[PDB]
């Protein structure tokens with residue numbers, strides 16, 4: 001892009017993926033002049049749907065966008081997902097790109113608290129996304145994340161993240177419509193495979 | 198439908214239409230077992246600046262085309278003059294004489310319309326709101342009064358966090374509209390340079 005080779009890495013369980021995630025990816029790509037956003041469904045952790053389901057929904061959701069792709073690195077590694085391993089794996093595939101690891105602000109707080117912050121900032125820049133008013137509801141998480149990272153971490157508020165996977169699962173459970181919360185292909189996957197019933 | 202012959206009427210300016218509106222229509226259709234939802238772009242408002250009616254019509258046609266349960270009506274944009282919901286309802290009642298009409302719009306707008314006794318004989322009213330929406334006091338008391346009497350329904354729609362105002366701002370700021378609305382609407386806004 002305008003600032004050199006840059007790759008977004010959208011880490012999440014994606015159970016299910018929804019337009020909130022897709023809007024967040026689009027926003028972060030625009031904000032940081034990213035060339036591509038790679039969606040990386042996380043390993044098995046509630047019990048999340050089987051990995052292949054979450055992979056396929058993400059493939060279906062992102063297929064039409066030339067600037068989105070999906071990586072199996074976390075689901076195929078085996079065992080729990082450590083963001084250091086995700087980033088190590090993607091650096092090896094894209095050694096000439098700066099990595100921008102993107103996930104929910106709550107998850108970013110967990111990653112940074114025990115994963116090994118200093119080694120993480122060697123591998124990537126970090127982007128935490130949330131619904132608006134995150135800083136107001138989480139004063140101290142926000143300021144602590146800011147102190148640790150400085151220029152390497154950025155928090156971004158996305159109105160469309162009012163759409164949550166938790167709400168989508170409940171809608172599916174209750175047979176309420178998922179139309180226009182996610183692509184029809186994902187609505188149908190959820191329906192066809194009976195995911196949250 | 199299961200609760201009777203029922204038609205949703207989604208009233209709004211739709212400048213632009215976005216997934217929040219489509220989600221809201223889908224939700225209200227489910228809650229009330231509506232057979233179909235008719236989107237009715239409003240007439241030009243009577244210093245508020247709103248895209249030409251044909252643009253708002255075409256965007257709403259593009260956005261709803263693929264859904265068999267959605268359609269778009271020109272009654273308000275073709276009537277001439279300012280839009281009075283009583284006229285919208287008279288026109289639609291004439292076109293769909295056996296349907297009970299469920300007029301659905303933003304909670305703010307539903308409160309504005311109620312400055313109503315004869316309107317409530319013509320349709321059932323549904324206000325849709327985004328989480329955390331802050332109403333002016335005059336609208337709060339209006340809505341409280343009718344809720345107190347079970348005379349209308351309010352429904353929270355998380356996807357209404359997506360707003361037409363924020364869409365126009367994104368377009369003005371050259372920020373992406375992808376996944377906030379269908380691609381055909383993103384492209385319409387772009388091709389016609391709507392919010393420059």
Ligand SMILES: NC(=O)c1ccc[n+]([C@@H]2O[C@H](COP(=O)([O-])OP(=O)(O)OC[C@H]3O[C@@H](n4cnc5c(N)ncnc54)[C@H](OP(=O)(O)O)[C@@H]3O)[C@@H](O)[C@H]2O)c1
Pocket residue numbers: 010011012013014020021024040042043081082083084102103104105106107108110111114115129161163164165166
């Ligand atoms: N020690 C570690 O390194 C460690 C620990 C925990 C998590 N993680 C990583 O952090 C990422 C997030 O995990 P998770 O989804 O399981 O967290 P989570 O606890 O299910 O999500 C926390 C919040 O973040 C949102 N969210 C998650 N991923 C998102 C994304 N990419 N874009 C926007 N919003 C997102 C969630 O909304 P939705 O439910 O709507 O998605 C929720 O509001 C994954 O890559 C995971 O591997 C790493």
Ligand SMILES: NC(=O)c1ccc[n+]([C@@H]2O[C@H](COP(=O)([O-])OP(=O)(O)OC[C@H]3O[C@@H](n4cnc5c(N)ncnc54)[C@H](OP(=O)(O)O)[C@@H]3O)[C@@H](O)[C@H]2O)c1
Pocket residue numbers: 207208209210211212217218221237239240242280281282283301302303304305306307309310325357359360361362
């Ligand atoms: N005297 C009257 O009879 C009278 C007076 C005023 C309004 N109205 C009618 O009220 C309706 C709304 O008018 P307007 O669009 O000009 O109001 P508005 O002031 O542009 O909308 C107020 C709020 O309602 C939301 N909204 C509007 N229509 C919506 C819909 N169908 N579904 C979900 N959210 C919706 C808007 O969000 P977005 O910006 O994201 O859409 C906004 O947050 C129209 O049918 C209009 O004809 C009638």
Ligand SMILES: [Cl-]
Pocket residue numbers: 241277278
């Ligand atoms: Cl006119």
Ligand SMILES: [Cl-]
Pocket residue numbers: 202292293294295296
């Ligand atoms: Cl009829």
